[PDB]
Amino acid sequence: MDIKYDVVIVGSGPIGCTYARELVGAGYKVAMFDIGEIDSGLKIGAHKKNTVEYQKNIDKFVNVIQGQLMSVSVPVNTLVVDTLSPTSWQASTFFVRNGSNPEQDPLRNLSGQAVTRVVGGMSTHWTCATPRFDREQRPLLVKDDADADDAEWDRLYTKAESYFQTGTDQFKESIRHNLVLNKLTEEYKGQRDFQQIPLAATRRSPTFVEWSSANTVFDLQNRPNTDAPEERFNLFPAVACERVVRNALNSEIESLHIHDLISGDRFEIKADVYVLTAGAVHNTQLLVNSGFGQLGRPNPANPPELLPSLGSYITEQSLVFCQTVMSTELIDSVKSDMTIRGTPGELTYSVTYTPGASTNKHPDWWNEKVKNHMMQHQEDPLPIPFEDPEPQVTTLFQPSHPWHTQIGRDAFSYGAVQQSIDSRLIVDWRFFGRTEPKEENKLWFSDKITDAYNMPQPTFDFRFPAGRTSKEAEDMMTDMCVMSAKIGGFLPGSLPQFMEPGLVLHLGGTHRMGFDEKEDNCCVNTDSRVFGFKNLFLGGCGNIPTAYGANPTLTAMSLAIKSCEYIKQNFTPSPF
Amino acid sequence: MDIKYDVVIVGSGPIGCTYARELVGAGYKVAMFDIGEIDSGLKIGAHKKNTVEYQKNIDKFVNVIQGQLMSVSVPVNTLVVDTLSPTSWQASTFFVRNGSNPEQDPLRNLSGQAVTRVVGGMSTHWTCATPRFDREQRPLLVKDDADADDAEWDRLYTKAESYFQTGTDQFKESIRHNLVLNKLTEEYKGQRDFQQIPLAATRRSPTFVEWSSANTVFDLQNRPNTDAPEERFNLFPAVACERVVRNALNSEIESLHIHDLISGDRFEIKADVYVLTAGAVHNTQLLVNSGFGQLGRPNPANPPELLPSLGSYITEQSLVFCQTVMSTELIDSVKSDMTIRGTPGELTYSVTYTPGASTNKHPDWWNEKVKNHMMQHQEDPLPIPFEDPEPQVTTLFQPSHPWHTQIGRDAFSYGAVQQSIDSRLIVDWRFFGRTEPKEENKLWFSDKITDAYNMPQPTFDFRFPAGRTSKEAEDMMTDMCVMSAKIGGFLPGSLPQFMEPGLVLHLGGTHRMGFDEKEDNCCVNTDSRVFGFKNLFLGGCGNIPTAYGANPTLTAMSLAIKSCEYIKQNFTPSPF
Amino acid sequence: NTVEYQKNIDKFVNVIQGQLMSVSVPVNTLVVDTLSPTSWQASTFFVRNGSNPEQDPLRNLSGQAVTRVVGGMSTHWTCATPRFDREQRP
Amino acid sequence: FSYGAVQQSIDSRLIVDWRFFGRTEPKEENKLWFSDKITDAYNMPQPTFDFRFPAGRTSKEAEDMMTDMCVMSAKIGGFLPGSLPQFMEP
Ligand SMILES: *Cc1cc2c(cc1C)Nc1c([nH]c(=O)[nH]c1=O)N2C[C@H](O)[C@H](O)[C@H](O)COP(=O)(O)OP(=O)(O)OC[C@H]1O[C@@H](n2cnc3c(N)ncnc32)[C@H](O)[C@@H]1O
Ligand SMILES: *Cc1cc2c(cc1C)Nc1c([nH]c(=O)[nH]c1=O)N2C[C@H](O)[C@H](O)[C@H](O)COP(=O)(O)OP(=O)(O)OC[C@H]1O[C@@H](n2cnc3c(N)ncnc32)[C@H](O)[C@@H]1O
Ligand SMILES: *Cc1cc2c(cc1C)Nc1c([nH]c(=O)[nH]c1=O)N2C[C@H](O)[C@H](O)[C@H](O)COP(=O)(O)OP(=O)(O)OC[C@H]1O[C@@H](n2cnc3c(N)ncnc32)[C@H](O)[C@@H]1O
Ligand SMILES: OC[C@H]1O[C@@H](O)[C@H](O)[C@@H](F)[C@H]1O
Ligand SMILES: OC[C@H]1O[C@@H](O)[C@H](O)[C@@H](F)[C@H]1O
Numbered sequence A, B: 001m002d003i004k005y006d007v008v009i010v011g012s013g014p015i016g017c018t019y020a021r022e023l024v025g026a027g028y029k030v031a032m033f034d035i036g037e038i039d040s041g042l043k044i045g046a047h048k049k050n051t052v053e054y055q056k057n058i059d060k061f062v063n064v065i066q067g068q069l070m071s072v073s074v075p076v077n078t079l080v081v082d083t084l085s086p087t088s089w090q091a092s093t094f095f096v097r098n099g100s101n102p103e104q105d106p107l108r109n110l111s112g113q114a115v116t117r118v119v120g121g122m123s124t125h126w127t128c129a130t131p132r133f134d135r136e137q138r139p140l141l142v143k144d145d146a147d148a149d150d151a152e153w154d155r156l157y158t159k160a161e162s163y164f165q166t167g168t169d170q171f172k173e174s175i176r177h178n179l180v181l182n183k184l185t186e187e188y189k190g191q192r193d194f195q196q197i198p199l200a201a202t203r204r205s206p207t208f209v210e211w212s213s214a215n216t217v218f219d220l221q222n223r224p225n226t227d228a229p230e231e232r233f234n235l236f237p238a239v240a241c242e243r244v245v246r247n248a249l250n251s252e253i254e255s256l257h258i259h260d261l262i263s264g265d266r267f268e269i270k271a272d273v274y275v276l277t278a279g280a281v282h283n284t285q286l287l288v289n290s291g292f293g294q295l296g297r298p299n300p301a302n303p304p305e306l307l308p309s310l311g312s313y314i315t316e317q318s319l320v321f322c323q324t325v326m327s328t329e330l331i332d333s334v335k336s337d338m339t340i341r342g343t344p345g346e347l348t349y350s351v352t353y354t355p356g357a358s359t360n361k362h363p364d365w366w367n368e369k370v371k372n373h374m375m376q377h378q379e380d381p382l383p384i385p386f387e388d389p390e391p392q393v394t395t396l397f398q399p400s401h402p403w404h405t406q407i408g409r410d411a412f413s414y415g416a417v418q419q420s421i422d423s424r425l426i427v428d429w430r431f432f433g434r435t436e437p438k439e440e441n442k443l444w445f446s447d448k449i450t451d452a453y454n455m456p457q458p459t460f461d462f463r464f465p466a467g468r469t470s471k472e473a474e475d476m477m478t479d480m481c482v483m484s485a486k487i488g489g490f491l492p493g494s495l496p497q498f499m500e501p502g503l504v505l506h507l508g509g510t511h512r513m514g515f516d517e518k519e520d521n522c523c524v525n526t527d528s529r530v531f532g533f534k535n536l537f538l539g540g541c542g543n544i545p546t547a548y549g550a551n552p553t554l555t556a557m558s559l560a561i562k563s564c565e566y567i568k569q570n571f572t573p574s575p576f
Numbered sequence C: 001n002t003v004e005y006q007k008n009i010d011k012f013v014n015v016i017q018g019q020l021m022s023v024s025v026p027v028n029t030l031v032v033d034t035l036s037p038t039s040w041q042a043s044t045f046f047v048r049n050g051s052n053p054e055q056d057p058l059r060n061l062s063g064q065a066v067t068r069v070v071g072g073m074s075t076h077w078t079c080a081t082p083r084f085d086r087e088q089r090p
Numbered sequence D: 001f002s003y004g005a006v007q008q009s010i011d012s013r014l015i016v017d018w019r020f021f022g023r024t025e026p027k028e029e030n031k032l033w034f035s036d037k038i039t040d041a042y043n044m045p046q047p048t049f050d051f052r053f054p055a056g057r058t059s060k061e062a063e064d065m066m067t068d069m070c071v072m073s074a075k076i077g078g079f080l081p082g083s084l085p086q087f088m089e090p
Helices: A014-025 A052-056 A058-067 A146-164 A175-187 A282-288 A328-334 A364-376 A468-484 A553-570 B014-025 B052-056 B058-067 B146-164 B175-187 B280-289 B328-333 B364-376 B468-484 B553-570 C003-007 C009-019 D057-073
Strands: A004-010 A029-033 A199-205 A208-211 A223-225 A228-236 A239-246 A253-260 A266-276 A318-326 A339-341 A350-352 A392-394 A403-408 A426-433 A442-450 A456-461 A488-490 A536-538 B004-010 B029-034 B199-205 B208-211 B223-225 B228-237 B239-246 B253-260 B266-276 B319-326 B339-341 B350-352 B392-394 B403-408 B426-433 B442-450 B456-461 B488-490 B536-538 D031-039 D045-050
Touching (some): A004 A014, A014 A029, A014 A228, A052 A208, A175 A392, A175 A403, A239 A266, A239 A282, A266 A282, A350 A364, A403 A468, A426 A468, A468 D057, B004 B014, B014 B029, B014 B228, B029 B239, B029 B266, B052 B208, B146 B553, B175 B364, B239 B280, B266 B280, B280 B442, C003 C009
Parallel strands (some): A004 A266, B004 B029, B004 B266, B266 B536
Antiparallel strands (some): A253 A266, A318 A488, A339 A350, A403 A426, A442 A456, B199 B208, B223 B228, B319 B488, B339 B350, B392 B403, D031 D045
């Protein structure tokens, strides 16, 4: 560890890795600090799903996800357990216990919000969906010139797509995927377009997909090294960043205060530039601990010195979910091109098709896979092959259906895992709604209660706004119900429902971007630079100030990229 | 990867690693293959609990366990789902779905049995309890000489204990541990002895314990390296070992057939010596796939060629579990020595005690902790400090209480963890019963059905033997109820119950050891060598042939140590 | 038609439950494998608690039930009495 | 006739129940028959069902019916957790 770096980046998620790739790339002397530790194997911060065992036993990966999601804010528990033995110790009140947050109102929480503290951050477990926002979801990076704004977005997005290895081809040969995609297309012809979810992933084999992660962006190995002898990068894991120190004029950051979690030591690190990419919640906490915004319960009569909007206008998307069991009609359509004769399990049984026939509803590869499955597994009642990959279908946000949709099998399942109905039949439905930014919706931090890292406890004051937000949300529920009945009926146990506020984990706007601090009620400009401050930059979902439905990580990468352009224009790397 | 080595080891668990430590160190060119991958972080095969994040969020670790425990044998599901939509595809029969085993009788299963395919095996998640077996649980290593037998076992156990870094003082200054230890000691004074569970762990700081793992035994780093310039070791993860090739004469293994899961290729690796430490079930699978024992549903009418005892006489322990909520008396007794002034929360509150008074019921280290907790947390109604370690208490197996006890807090919780009752009040109780070895209790492998690695499906035919085993399992149950009541009443949601057979993962006897193949109905001798074969060695709990109550891993490591002496005497390493 | 039920409408479900007897219940095959080893334990799923061995669990009307009291099901019914239109009417 | 534990967290003044009942085509294959071996609680022949909702119209209307409840109910309110849209036991 040095005293002095060109850039210091807080957090090693896919956004801090975008800063590193770009800046380590341009020859800056870079350090990265993460509170969490390396635990994805030898590929530092790689996706935990990239092991043969997980992709053979995909129902188990939910436990990984759960094991690294720590709830942000848990109100104090008021369940009545009144069947204790009379000898057992009991309290006469519902006291603060098991780490609960007494500031938190149970009825205005994002009870589902959680954070992850591991190198690679949430990108070690995430679903890899990386859609672009269209104009209506997207921040303006140029006022008054929609084409120049368009041009700038597309250039950033294409570059961001290349860091993540985003593609829309990795599921093209799944029967199940094409079954669903084709029926949805047919049933909505013209009115909605369907496609593969764009995914940051590469297919290694029919049974294996290399899911992208922060490691894909930048491999997080220390440099110089044989492969980049001219580059300078050090990752320090198990290091909690506590505070940035402001100069008296509030125009410059002067140091980063850290705590080595293993040695217990505390340091002050000097850099030319300080980049904070610790998550939409922990960026906020870091700032507030450093005198930005306002510690404690919001009070308007006490107007904050720096960044009045910090932690206001927060957005989290609505989520509705269900699972369906494929219709008989759809399962029978899988074998539509086949001539089936005799009795399965007997030597006279056959199943054949006519290759090339233009009246075949399916291409030859489909019919070959069905034929083989049906002939080698005569004991199974379904035409679907056993290792068939899941669907990954989307119809993207449009003004007429202003929500995002994911139709397939997500590794993050919500209940006990059903065993009675065959998996091949089951389709997941997830519709994500956009939420209006409102000043009243807040993340703020206790001045008295602290977290497990002795930082100020985050606390939420949130309700989905009335008006458009609530109307679209129930219109979204209805849409899911309508659309999903095209594929089949609901799975008992996975009936249509809203999920817990924040389980979806696309929290935005906690440190939101705008052209004008005051006019646009915001904390960073369109270079992601904190207003006032020459050398402090925020990355991540916290920056997005608009109401969006799609998954945000791509877009936040795109912003980080344009942040790094600004850095390169204003700060000179130290000579190697 | 070479075509030839001196030794090849299958499986990177702690037995695998025991063989590696011995033979690498003695200069043999060794290669170890594991079907699972390095995930655990930069210390290969290290314990997953060893992160700052899991030791602050100890209730999350159950998610890591569940995440890498894959059920061995699931019978065909017969749950009725009769609220499907009538458009949905409906089964006419209870067909084979979701990887289930149609061979398995659901009424004679070890349904909680599971396996783990990661480098380091189950020692990446285990609880690290490492007691010795007493005579009554232990197999004889010397005939007709009880004291020679004890001496050899003491020699081996001492060595194993150094390898694992077993200790009995890691929890010596925990109030909870000592609170429970003292009450039990007193209530059974002169009748039973209570001590800390022997743990493979090293305490690093008051809030952090470095749990031991396979990594502790052997660091799995390829050699030579700087720390070891004349050793030769290579670890090949993501390689499925599928068969050991017997010579036609049945006296020698000629090669190991492997499947590299990443490239998809197959190879044949030669060695001088072959060691199987794939785990009790999978050592048995791999042998049965290579021609030992009998493939398919057992048939007396046809005799196995080789190792007719293979997969018979299997033992699994009964397990009874509950949780308790600490008595008012015991909680009150925690602050017995304190003098308290004023009223909590004001500048007037004072809590003090007198170091060394022999009115004091507790020591100084205890009172100082309570004091500091009560002064710094005056809102809190409990005098137990917040970061106080869990109890880790046992009374070891004896003739009048022939069961193992662990009392404290296990990471392997078996219901959703309640948040209503303060965690500091809860104590777990687990009593482990011994099971008589019987020929009829069996692990066998199907000749048609395969598992996800395309190996023969494992199937159990098991029932806890009537007579002593059943009588004791019920007596155990009762003792747990009687004992636990001295500490407090039951926690609702964790009432006294038997766990699902096999849930304890202490399976043994599947490839069991003895002096003679026939008289002792066994598969390996006391050098762990397979009868008939010069150069095939088995390690693990499957070797243990007796009825045991306590955690088997140290005993199985002991065996491997003895096995390595033989190997060292009877095979010469290739030149460097 | 008691004042007590009309003031505690939530409780009336129990009256209904009290008098609906299942017509045909298949033989149960739920696995309970956490019995004490000393407890008497089935080797098969045999005909238990008045179940019907003739009944295919997968081609049942499991919710079907009968009431045996004077007044029959009219002692508990919801009292909804619509006419059928032609489409539904013999 | 409520179907689970009566939830108590939500003011019952707010709660509206939706039930939509579909029609079923008569098919000779759908039968109630009686065992000549097994007998019920009063020593009469045990009733047994062989029943599946017919494919075709009965099925298509069932699922169209379920959508119509979703679509209609949403005019009045969102679903009450624990009483989400479901088909009930036949
Ligand atoms: C968990 C999850 C996440 C997402 C998906 C599903 C699941 C279950 N799927 C999904 C996601 N996003 C999408 O775009 N598409 C998908 O299909 N998920 C969200 C995605 O995972 C996140 O948006 C993305 O990682 C955010 O990137 P980031 O801004 O780089 O933030 P991270 O949270 O990943 O990591 C920040 C990081 O910093 C650390 N940290 C926290 N506090 C400190 C302090 N004080 N000092 C130093 N370091 C700090 C972390 O430990 C962490 O690594
Ligand atoms: C899961 C668990 C286990 C234990 C405790 C708690 C819980 C939650 N507690 C514990 C236990 N043991 C004790 O002695 N003390 C207690 O506190 N647990 C059990 C203990 O973990 C095991 O007994 C021990 O690891 C067994 O060691 P081993 O014989 O070396 O077995 P492993 O299962 O650890 O690893 C073998 C291994 O080989 C692989 N494998 C399997 N098949 C193949 C094939 N065909 N080719 C190559 N490799 C293969 C695996 O991937 C695995 O790593
Ligand atoms: C239980 C129930 C029933 C109805 C509603 C609510 C619920 C929970 N709601 C509903 C009703 N139908 C409507 O049209 N609209 C509504 O809002 N329910 C159904 C209605 O309750 C029935 O259709 C009606 O009672 C049928 O009348 P029934 O043809 O007269 O038949 P019952 O079952 O009422 O009475 C028959 C009766 O005969 C007896 N019995 C049975 N076996 C024997 C033998 N072997 N010997 C002599 N007597 C026998 C009974 O004990 C009973 O009293
Ligand atoms: O709850 C799971 C969901 O969580 C969001 O973060 C993801 O973007 C979706 F892909 C989906 O996996
Ligand atoms: O089921 C929980 C138990 O699991 C066994 O494998 C362990 O040996 C016990 F220490 C305890 O952790």
